[PDB]
C-alpha cells in the first residue's frame, strides 16, 4: 500500500515537479518546502540508483524534457519522423511542462490549440505590473479587427488587477468562483512568446434565461443587483425581465433517487413533444456517481410502455461482463483462509460453470441443499482444517464427516447401527446417490488447492497457478471464455510487471488477490456513449460536448463535487502552483462547462427532502450560487417594482418545482404545466 501510494506521488512529481526530482537526484534538498520531504529525496535517489543497478534505461519523464527543449531550441527546421501538424482539442487543463515542450515544438511543427473559454475577454491573472505589457498584444479575429481587454488601458489599473495577485473583480461572479481551473490555464497560454492567438466568438443573443447567463459570462459583466443604496434597493425594474414560459433553466426538488429519475423521464418526454426536431442523442444526463443511480436509470427506462419507451445508453459504468465467474474465482483464491461454511460451498455451486465441470445438474442441486442440511454439514471441510485454526478437533459436522455419513448410508441402512461412530444417512441409497460422488470429487479438489495456496511463492511460480485453477474448477463455455480470458490477461499482466521490475522475494496469495480486486473493477466501457440513445454517464473532466438538452442529477450537498483528499504527506498540496490539478477544481469547472454547453434547455435536479425520515437536504454550493445569481439578476413580470430581495426569492420559488413523494399522487395528473405522462397510475390516482 505504501509502495503504490508513493509511486503515485513520484509520477505526479515527474509531471508537475521536474525540478524537485532534479535536485533530489543529486541529493540536495529544496529550500522552503513542507515537512516529510526529508525521507522522500533518498527514496527517489535510491530508486534512480537501484534501477541503474538493474541495467534499465536511466532516462525518465523528468530529466528528459529539459534536453528535449534544448535540442529543439537550436537545430534545423526539419527533424526526421515528426508529423506535419498536430491538434489539441477539448483539453482545458495542461501542466506547464507540456506547454513548454509544445512552445519549443512550434518552431518546426505547426500546432493548433482548440480551447473553449466562456469569456471572450481576458479573465486570467497577472504576474507583475510589468507583465501586463506582454499581455497587451492583440487577438486576431475573422473580422481582421484587433481585439483587446475591455475598457482598454483603464481596466488594467482599475479595481480589476489589484495588489500583487491576479484579477479581483473578474466580472461575472460565476466565472470567478467556478473557473479557477481555466484561470491558470489561460494564464499559461498567454505566456507563450511565439504563440499566435486568434479568436472566433459567436455572440449569444439573449432571449431565454439560459442565453441570458451565457451572455453575462461571455461579455464578463455582473448583472446581479446588490442594492448598495436604498434608491437602487427599491426599484426592481432595473434587472432583466424573465418570461414565465421559459423552460430553459429549471430546478427540481425530489425525494429519492428513484422518484428523481422517474420525474426526469416525464420531463424528457415533454421536451421531445414540445419541439419538432429533438434527438435523444442530443440529450445528455450527467450524474454524480453513475453506479449508484444505474439500477434506477435502468428501471424507469426499461419499464416504460412501447409507445412511451425511449432508447437509453449508460456510459462510464464500471464494465462487468460475468459477475459470478469473477466473484467465485476471487472466493476460490481465499481457499487457504476460508472456513468453508456450507452456504459458501453451495454458493460456489451456484455458478453453472463450476457445476458443469463436476456435472452437477440444477435439478440435482436441490437434493444437495436438503442433504447437506440434514446430514449435518456445517463446519470446515476436514479435521486437519479444524486444528489449523487452533480450534479443538471434533470429527463431526465437517464435509468429511458429512460425506462419510452420506456414503455410509448408501451402503448400509440407518437401521443397522453405528460403525465408526458415524451414523449412516439413509436418504440416498439409490441411483440418486451418484451426485454424492460428484460432490465428493469437488471437495477433493478444494482440499488439494487449499494446501497448495498456503505457501508463499516467487512471482515466477504464480504464473501457471491461474491457468491450472481455471481449467480444473471450471468447464469453459462460449459465454464464459471471454471473462476467463480477461482473468488470465489481467493476472499475467500483474506478474509481468513484477517480473519486469525484478522482484525475487516470495509473495503471499493475499497480496495478489486484493490486487486483482482493484484492477478488475477499474475497467469501464465508453462504447455506448454517442450511440444515439439518450446519454447517461457521470461527469468526466475535460470532456465537454455541446448539447441542446443537458440534465444533472445527484446535486445534493456533499455528493457533489466529488471529494478526494490528498495523501497528506504530498508536497504539492503544501505549495500549490499554476498548473496543479485538484479534483475539487475539476468538478467545479465541470459545472461551468455543463452550463455553457447547453444550447437550449438546462436541467438541474437534487433531493431537497429525504424520503426516509422526511428531513431537509441541501443542493451543492455550485447550484446554490447559480440560483442566487438568477434571482438577483432577474425579476418576474408580475411585479416590476417590489423589492430586491422580495423579487429575488420570488424568482427562485418560481423556477424551483417540488415533485410529490409517490408516483400515484394525484397532484402529478392535474392539468397544467407539469403533468406526468405515466398512464399506469392514472386509474390509481382516480
Amino acid at each position: 500500500q505504501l509502495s503504490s501510494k508513493a509511486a503515485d506521488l513520484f509520477d505526479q512529481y515527474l509531471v508537475y515537479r521536474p525540478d524537485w526530482l532534479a535536485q533530489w537526484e543529486t541529493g540536495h534538498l529544496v529550500e522552503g518546502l513542507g515537512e516529510a520531504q526529508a525521507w522522500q529525496a533518498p527514496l527517489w535517489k535510491a530508486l534512480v540508483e537501484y534501477t541503474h543497478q538493474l541495467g534499465q534505461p536511466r532516462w525518465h519523464r523528468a530529466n528528459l524534457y529539459q534536453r528535449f527543449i534544448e535540442t529543439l531550441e537550436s537545430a534545423t527546421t526539419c527533424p526526421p519522423g515528426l508529423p506535419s501538424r498536430v491538434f489539441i482539442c477539448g483539453i482545458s487543463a495542461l501542466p506547464p511542462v507540456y506547454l513548454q515542450a509544445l512552445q519549443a515544438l512550434g518552431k518546426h511543427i505547426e500546432i493548433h490549440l482548440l480551447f473553449t473559454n466562456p469569456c471572450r475577454y481576458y479573465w486570467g491573472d497577472i504576474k507583475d505590473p510589468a507583465y501586463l505589457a506582454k499581455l497587451l498584444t492583440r487577438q486576431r479575429r475573422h473580422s481582421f479587427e484587433d481585439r483587446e481587454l475591455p475598457l482598454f488601458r483603464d481596466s488594467e489599473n482599475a479595481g480589476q488587477l489589484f495588489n500583487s495577485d491576479g484579477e479581483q473583480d473578474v466580472g461575472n461572479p460565476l466565472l470567478a468562483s467556478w473557473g479557477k481551473l481555466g484561470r491558470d490555464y489561460i494564464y499559461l497560454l498567454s505566456d507563450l512568446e511565439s504563440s499566435q492567438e486568434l479568436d472566433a466568438f459567436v455572440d449569444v443573443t439573449p432571449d431565454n434565461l439560459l442565453h441570458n447567463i451565457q451572455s453575462d459570462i461571455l461579455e464578463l459583466e455582473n448583472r446581479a443587483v446588490a442594492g448598495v443604496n436604498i434608491e437602487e434597493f427599491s426599484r426592481s425594474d432595473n434587472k432583466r425581465p424573465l418570461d414565465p414560459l421559459d423552460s430553459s433553466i429549471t430546478f427540481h426538488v425530489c425525494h429519492s433517487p428513484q422518484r428523481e429519475v422517474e420525474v426526469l423521464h416525464d420531463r424528457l418526454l415533454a421536451m421531445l413533444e414540445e419541439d419538432p426536431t429533438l434527438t435523444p442523442r442530443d440529450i445528455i444526463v450527467m450524474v454524480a456517481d453513475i453506479d449508484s443511480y444505474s439500477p434506477f436509470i435502468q428501471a424507469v427506462f426499461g419499464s416504460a410502455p412501447a409507445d412511451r419507451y425511449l432508447p437509453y445508453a449508460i456510459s462510464d459504468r464500471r464494465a462487468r461482463q460475468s459477475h459470478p465467474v469473477l466473484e467465485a474465482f476471487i472466493s476460490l483464491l481465499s481457499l487457504p483462509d476460508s472456513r468453508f461454511v456450507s452456504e459458501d460451498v453451495l454458493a460456489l455451486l451456484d455458478v453453472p460453470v463450476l457445476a458443469a465441470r463436476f456435472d452437477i445438474t440444477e435439478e440435482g442441486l436441490r437434493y444437495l441443499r436438503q442433504w447437506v442440511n440434514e446430514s449435518g454439514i456445517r463446519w470446515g471441510i476436514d479435521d486437519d482444517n479444524v486444528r489449523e485454526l487452533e480450534l479443538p478437533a471434533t470429527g463431526q459436522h465437517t464435509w468429511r464427516f458429512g460425506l462419510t455419513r452420506m456414503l455410509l448410508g448408501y451402503a448400509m441402512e440407518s437401521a443397522q447401527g453405528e460403525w465408526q461412530s458415524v451414523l449412516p444417512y439413509d436418504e440416498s441409497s439409490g441411483l440418486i446417490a451418484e451426485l454424492v460422488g460428484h460432490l465428493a470429487s469437488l471437495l477433493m479438489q478444494l482440499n488439494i488447492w487449499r494446501r497448495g495456496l498456503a505457501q508463499e511463492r516467487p512471482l515466477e511460480e504464480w504464473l501457471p497457478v491461474c491457468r491450472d485453477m481455471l481449467n480444473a474448477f471450471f468447464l469453459p463455455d462460449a459465454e464464459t471464455e471471454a471473462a476467463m480470458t480477461l482473468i488470465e490477461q489481467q493476472w499475467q499482466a500483474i506478474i509481468a510487471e513484477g517480473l519486469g521490475a525484478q522482484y525475487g522475494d516470495a509473495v503471499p496469495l493475499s497480496l495478489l488477490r486484493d490486487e486483482l480486486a482493484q484492477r478488475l473493477d477499474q475497467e469501464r466501457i465508453s462504447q455506448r456513449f454517442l450511440a444515439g440513445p439518450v446519454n447517461i454517464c457521470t461527469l468526466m473532466p475535460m470532456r465537454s460536448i455541446p448539447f441542446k438538452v443537458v440534465c444533472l442529477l445527484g446535486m445534493n450537498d456533499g455528493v457533489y463535487p466529488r471529494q478526494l483528499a490528498p495523501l497528506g504527506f504530498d508536497l504539492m498540496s503544501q505549495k500549490p502552483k499554476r498548473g496543479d490539478r485538484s479534483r475539487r477544481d475539476d468538478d467545479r469547472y465541470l459545472f461551468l462547462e455543463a452550463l455553457i454547453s447547453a444550447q437550449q434547455k438546462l436541467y438541474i435536479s437534487y433531493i431537497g427532502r429525504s424520503i426516509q425520515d422526511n428531513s431537509e437536504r441541501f443542493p451543492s454550493v455550485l447550484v446554490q450560487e447559480l440560483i442566487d445569481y438568477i434571482g438577483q439578476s432577474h425579476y418576474l413580470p408580475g411585479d416590476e417594482a417590489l423589492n430586491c430581495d422580495e423579487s429575488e426569492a420570488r424568482v427562485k420559488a418560481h423556477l424551483t418545482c417540488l415533485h410529490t413523494r409517490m408516483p400515484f399522487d394525484p397532484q402529478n395528473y392535474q392539468p397544467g404545466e407539469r403533468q406526468s405522462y405515466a398512464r399506469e397510475w392514472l386509474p390509481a390516482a382516480s
Binding site: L269, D307, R308, E481, P671, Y677, W681
Partner: protein
C-alpha cells in the same frame, strides 16, 4: 376531482445508432478453436515485424504471455514464416516486402449513412453487379440510420497501388484442400462476408478520395484480399488467400446510395 394524463402523439424516437457489420448479419487445424485462440492469432500479426524473420524466443514469450505452453512455438514460428512469404494476387506481393512506411495496422473508420438503409433496397443493387450475392437469400436487417463502424486488419500500398487485407481463422474441422476457390467463396457467402468487404471498400474509397489529392478508383485500387490463417500452406499458393476486385460500377452507385 377530475384528472388526466398526457399522451405523446408523435413517435417517441426514430432509429439513430452506430453499429458495425456485426449489427447487420447478427498441422494448422489442430490449433484450438474459440474466441481466445482467434484473438491470439490476430495479436500475433498485430505487433509482428514483416521484414525481419521470426525469432523463436519471441514466439515462446508470446505464447507464455497468452498462457499457452511450449508445445506450440515449434509449430508456430514455422507456420508464421509460411504466411509472410506467401505471394498475393497476380503481382506476387510477399508480406515481408512491405516496409513500415507503407504499413497501416488496425484502421478504425466511421462511415455515416444518411438516409435509412433498407435491406431489399440494398441487396437488389448488390446481387445486380456482384456474382457472389446470387447464393443465399437476401440480407435481413432492420432500417438503420447513423454511423457505421469497422476494423481493417491491414492496409498497405505496393507499386503505388493500395490493397485491403483481413484475417479470418475459424474452421475447426478442416485442414486439407477443403480450403479452395469454390469452398472459400462458399463460406464467404455463408458468413455474409460479401457485404463486409463491399462496405470496407466504400470506406477505403472515401478515405483515399479524401486524403489523396486527385484520386481515381481504377488507378490506385488493387482489390480486396481475405487471408485465412489456417489455410495458408507452403504447397499450394492459392489455398488460404482470396482476392476479388469490386466491379467499380457497384461502388459508384453504392456511394450515391449512402450519400442520398
Amino acid at each position: 376531482a377530475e384528472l388526466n394524463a398526457k399522451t405523446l402523439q408523435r413517435l417517441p424516437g426514430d432509429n439513430w445508432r452506430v453499429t458495425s457489420y456485426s449489427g447487420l448479419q447478427q498441422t494448422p487445424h489442430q490449433f484450438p478453436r474459440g474466441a481466445s485462440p482467434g484473438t491470439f492469432l490476430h495479436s500475433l500479426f498485430e505487433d509482428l515485424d514483416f521484414t525481419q524473420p521470426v525469432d523463436p524466443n519471441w514466439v515462446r514469450e508470446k505464447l507464455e504471455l497468452g498462457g499457452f505452453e511450449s508445445q506450440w512455438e515449434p509449430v508456430l514460428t514455422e507456420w508464421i514464416t509460411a504466411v509472410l512469404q506467401a505471394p498475393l494476387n497476380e503481382t506476387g506481393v510477399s508480406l515481408s516486402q512491405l516496409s513500415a512506411r507503407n504499413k497501416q495496422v488496425e484502421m478504425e473508420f466511421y462511415l455515416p449513412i444518411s438516409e435509412p438503409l433498407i435491406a431489399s433496397q440494398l441487396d437488389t443493387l448488390i446481387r445486380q453487379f456482384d456474382p457472389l450475392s446470387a447464393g443465399c437469400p437476401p440480407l435481413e436487417f432492420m432500417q438503420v440510420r447513423g454511423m457505421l463502424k469497422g476494423f481493417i486488419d491491414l492496409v498497405f500500398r505496393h507499386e503505388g497501388r493500395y490493397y485491403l487485407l483481413d484475417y479470418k481463422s475459424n474452421w475447426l474441422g478442416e485442414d486439407s484442400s477443403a480450403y479452395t476457390q469454390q469452398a472459400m467463396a462458399a463460406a464467404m457467402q455463408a458468413h455474409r462476408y460479401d457485404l463486409q468487404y463491399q462496405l470496407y471498400t466504400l470506406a477505403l474509397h472515401r478515405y483515399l478520395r479524401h486524403r489523396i489529392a486527385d484520386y481515381d478508383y481504377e488507378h490506385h485500387f488493387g482489390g480486396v484480399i481475405y487471408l485465412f490463417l489456417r489455410g495458408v500452406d507452403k504447397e499450394h499458393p492459392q489455398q488460404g488467400i482470396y482476392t476479388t476486385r469490386p466491379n467499380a460500377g457497384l461502388i459508384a452507385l453504392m456511394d450515391e446510395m449512402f450519400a442520398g
